[PDB]
């Protein structure tokens, strides 16, 4: 497909994708084990600006 | 455009696309008459999964 | 129980329960691991048009 | 099924179900041209209540 | 004002405000005990329609 | 009424309010097949931004 | 009908309908008065999951 | 128009429009710079109330 | 507790806590009969901040 | 990037830019100073349809 | 950290922290397999009543 | 204030605080000009597990 998962986020580098920092959720990825991507930001951002919610 | 609705979501196969099992809604697109494709399945899950809302 | 879980959903076939299509979600179930049945969609469709979010 | 959508919801009386009561859009089921039974109160109710959203 | 309260929504007359028909919440209002006047269900349906 | 549903939307222009520039949604409306009068705006804008 | 409210839900033994534990609200029912029971759970939990929201 | 923006809200007198209290956000406000008059209270209490969300 | 209720809102001057100033809801606390305090301001700004809704 | 924002929305020929028609939110953007291309159209359009909001 | 996860939120004293009670999910936890500690009941209360969503 | 917004929130690095990489917002904080603390990610993770919505 012309935008892919791994197009979209990339596995955490603070916490290898477990999402933790024990005994508290990691705070670079807010738990989700994902940051985003370039592109997977700027959808996302164009999302939640014309939805808000 | 690159990607177009037709590259999101097709016709469902249960209801045709009426999206309705009469007197209930279709079951397999929720009343939708369509159901996704894998590139608007990757692109929902991840809005989703990064709004949560 | 007048209505229990596997009266409103049932495990997804294509992933079988795991909600993934390596390296994306599943299609079937967006990721989800579960389908609906006909009498969890009837309960989900009046939710949602009633409440819609 | 052990809930049907009829047991949920029935025609709007005063608009017939066509949702609109020119030029505006019926009051009494507010355009969806339905309105609740006991049983799609009860269940409606409960949701919004527990959810809000 | 312009448009108050009682311009918008009205007691309801099934369970004349208690939002109750015991032991169930009333099916006319949904428990809230008053129903939508015509300019109230005229800005409902647009703010929903646009905002969802 | 003092605010009617003409007051708050109006005919989309580019779709003729169908909603379709087959087979995609019309760009302006987003497939409602209306846009908003000035009041709708000043309406909805409120809203949007006190309750989001 | 088949679903009550009483089925779905019960008053709370920490507050007793209350809902509040001056001058906090009682975090058994979080203000709410009532505790689900099962059947309860499993609806919330059911719509939940499909409408996240 | 009947209802010009001026009539929904009026600039906050505390942060005179700039919805801050340095380091931190206004909170007669909450950071919006605006508060509400009596036909904006109305109206949005309306809303909320039958929309919630 | 670290962070309590009168620690995140205090009762309403202009209605003293009723919510209401009849026929209309209380224009300074939009009903609620409480108003923020500035720890309750911060913290209210920050969440709708990063969720939105 | 496959998709970039100036692919999804532009700016809006009737503010400009400024989301306003003083002293009111301009009625073509609703404040927000852009509109969308065909592109964002349809990308949002399935969105809101699959999530509702 | 001044408000630990810890002080938010505890395991659920009756799945032990499954969230399940299967085939069903927990009905006092409803499936999180934590339940609120008064911290976390005042605060989450807070929100929802300042967010109404 | 025993949480201040900088206890909750700093400046991005990436944008140090313009929430943009021209032509497109900022990846690492949304276009948001800010990212969490360990303190911010603990509160909102909270927040969003128990609301999510
Ligand atoms: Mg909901
Ligand atoms: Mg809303
Ligand atoms: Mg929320
Ligand atoms: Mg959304
Ligand atoms: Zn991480
Ligand atoms: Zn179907
Ligand atoms: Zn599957
Ligand atoms: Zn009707
Ligand atoms: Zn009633
Ligand atoms: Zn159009
Ligand atoms: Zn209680
Ligand atoms: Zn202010
Ligand atoms: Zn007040
Ligand atoms: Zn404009
Ligand atoms: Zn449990
Ligand atoms: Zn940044």
């Known amino acids: 497909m012309v935008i892919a998962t791994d197009d979209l986020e990339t596995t955490c580098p603070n916490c290898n994708g ?27 951002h164009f999302i939640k600006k014309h939805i808000h919610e």
Chains 1, 2, 3, 4, 7, 8, 9, 10, 11, 12 share one sequence.
């Open 18 to 44: 477990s999402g933790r920092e024990e005994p508290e959720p990691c705070p670079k990825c807010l738990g989700k084990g994902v940051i985003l991507t370039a592109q997977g930001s700027t959808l996302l």
